[PDB]
Amino acid sequence: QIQLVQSGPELKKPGETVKISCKASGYTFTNYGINWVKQAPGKGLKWMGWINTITEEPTFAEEFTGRFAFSLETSASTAYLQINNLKNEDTATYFCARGSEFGRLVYWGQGASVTVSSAKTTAPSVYPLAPVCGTGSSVTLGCLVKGYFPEPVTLTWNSGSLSSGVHTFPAVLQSDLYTLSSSVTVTSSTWPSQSITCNVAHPASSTKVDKKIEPRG
Amino acid sequence: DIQMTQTTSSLSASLGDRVTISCSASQGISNYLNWYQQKPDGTVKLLIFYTSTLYSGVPSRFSGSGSGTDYSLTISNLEPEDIATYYCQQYSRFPYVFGGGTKLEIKRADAAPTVSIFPPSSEQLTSGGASVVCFLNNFYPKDINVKWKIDGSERQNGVLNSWTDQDSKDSTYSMSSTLTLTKDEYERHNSYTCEATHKTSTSPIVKSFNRN
């Protein structure tokens, strides 16, 4: 029943302030402490520090002193992580973990993503990718998702009915915008015999796009 | 702060085999070390605390050992659900420090990449853009180098690459290389090739097209 619930994803400009909450439940809140862990995208876990839930006193690591603050509200059983004057290096996922005996980090939170950028909310440009008129057993189709912000976006083939032979590539940043691509490989006897539609949905801008892949010509 | 270093960042092994992940420290932490597992979806769970005490809910095929500065995590019967990134953590003296982390990957038979090249969409060309996409799907091992030769000359800048993690199904790898440039730049030349240099072949695999 022990669980740590964190707030949703955050989108801030450089120099702004972000506040991350960590709701504790299923136990006595004042019996254990809360740890905070930073993880940059593609990087390893970094122990930021922990806060005593009785004395409300934080214990930060080496690099997390100055613009970082641990806080809590005893009546609401919720810990808080605040970062002031946000920078590009602050772009990471921040986990909260309950501090048990033997200095172990147990009952981790789902993590709260923080994105520091100046980019505005931008809808993706869904583009169909068909091969050249010029053979073989199988045929690979594609779907280009260019220049959107922020994450995430959802890409399915034929309303999720087409799952096998699908490679959805991780989003890559280019001029502060995300670009995603996905490949689908099917037999020659089903395309262009049957409709292959790329289903791209970007909820941040309320965008839903269905894109059929047509033969070049 | 103590420097917790894991000498191996990437590790490959066949299913069923025994794997051992080491963890080194700059100081003696006196068996005050913990092991964690981070599944591909990002979720983190405690495996072994206090060097050897398996945590509640952890399979018996997990084991940890070591003393002083050197410690190790061992998985006897490697299973597909054990494919994750493992971090070591000391708690002798504050502040706590995680290790670099070791990514675990499944070993399989080598496979040649399936190279597919794609011309800019007609819908994109109307927007002034012209992305040339090159798919390199289902290959092994992970190591691979791409080369965008344009008019016989290698195009260095303007190349946007994306790599997938190891496939959950066939344990292969895939890459998406995109030559991002405008319509004007796309019409200045007329020879877009895509060289795929991989272990499986002496000569690289070449896919190309032309807007003739």
Author numbering:
A (entry chain H): 1 to 134, 137 to 219
B (entry chain L): 1 to 212
Sentences from the paper on this structure:
In the case of malaria, our most advanced vaccine candidates aim to promote the production of antibodies that recognize the circumsporozoite protein (CSP) molecule on the surface of the invasive parasite stage called the sporozoite. In this report we use X-ray crystallography to determine the structure of CSP-binding antibodies at the atomic level. The N- and C-terminal domains of CSP from all Plasmodium species are separated by a repeat region, which was the target of the original mAbs. Strikingly, isothermal titration calorimetry (ITC), structural analyses, and mutagenesis-validated modeling revealed that the CSP repeat can be bound by around six antibodies suggesting that the repeat may potentially crosslink multiple BCRs on the surface of a B cell.
The 2.5 Å structure contained a single polypeptide in the asymmetric unit, whereas the 3.0 Å structure contained three essentially identical chains. All of the polypeptide chains were modeled in good quality electron density maps, except for residues 134–137 of the light chain. This loop is located at the opposite end of the FAB fragment to the variable region and not directly relevant to antigen binding. We found that each (NANP)6 peptide was bound to by ~2 FAB fragments (2.8 repeats per FAB domain). Our model predicted that the interaction with (NANP)6 would be mainly between CDR2 and CDR3 of the light chain and CDR2 and CDR3 of the heavy chain. The binding mode of the FAB fragment to the (NANP)6 peptide is centered on two proline residues from two non-adjacent NANP-repeats. These cyclic side-chains are hydrophobic in character and are buried deeply in the core of the FAB antigen binding site, into hydrophobic pockets formed by Y38 and Y56 of the light chain and the interface between the two chains. In contrast, the polar asparagine residues on the sides of the helix are involved in hydrogen bonding interactions with a number of polar residues on the edge of the binding site, such as N57 of the heavy chain. Due to the twisting of the (NANP)6 repeat, the binding epitope of the peptide is 2.5–3 alternate NANP repeats, with a symmetrical epitope available for binding on the opposite face.
